[PDB]
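queue> pop job 88
queue> type: inverse folding (structure -> sequence)
queue> payload:
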């Protein structure tokens, strides 16, 4: 049992809710919140900009030190950093950005990072400003993630379409 509330069950391990991931994280304080990161951990917009703002820029400060030490992530890769006031940990995962021409096959590799964590609160990878089709992202999530994932979908119209088209 966990405290995630109001989710629709899609499969044995995938759950979905129309919710603002920042507010969800503040309420639940999950062990892991996933960020829709880029390879430079520059949290400018989308989910990343929102999560970072909620940490009062502490996420960005930590991230800049991470990059200075380790260099950029890979597309499809991840790193675990602090969850600050949102979660115990933040799993920064880089899905491909279609607006950069990045190969959508890397979306599966990106979701594989979730399997290193028994429970996650997450957005749909590569959706939003990353340019991929969110229906496709949900399909890859369902077909790749085996651990328990609680998906927060920002946009209500999209949430309803994701549910109503789910196979």
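queue> result:
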């Amino acid at each position: 049992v966990n405290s995630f509330s109001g989710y629709l069950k899609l499969t044995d391990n995938v759950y979905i809710k129309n919710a603002d991931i920042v507010e969800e994280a503040k309420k639940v304080k999950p062990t892991v919140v996933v960020n829709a990161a880029n390879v430079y951990l520059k949290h400018g917009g989308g989910v990343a900009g929102a999560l970072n703002k909620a940490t009062n820029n502490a996420m960005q400060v930590e991230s800049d030190d991470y990059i200075a030490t380790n260099g950029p992530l890979k597309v499809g890769g991840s790193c675990v950093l602090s969850g600050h006031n949102l979660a115990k940990h933040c799993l920064h995962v880089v899905g491909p950005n279609v607006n950069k021409g990045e190969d959508i096959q890397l979306l599966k590799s990106a979701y594989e990072n979730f399997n290193q964590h028994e429970v996650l609160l997450a957005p749909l990878l590569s959706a939003g400003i990353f340019g991929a089709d969110p229906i496709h992202s949900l399909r890859v999530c369902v077909d790749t993630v085996r651990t328990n994932v609680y998906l927060a979908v920002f946009d209500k119209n999209l949430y309803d379409k994701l549910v109503s088209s789910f196979l």
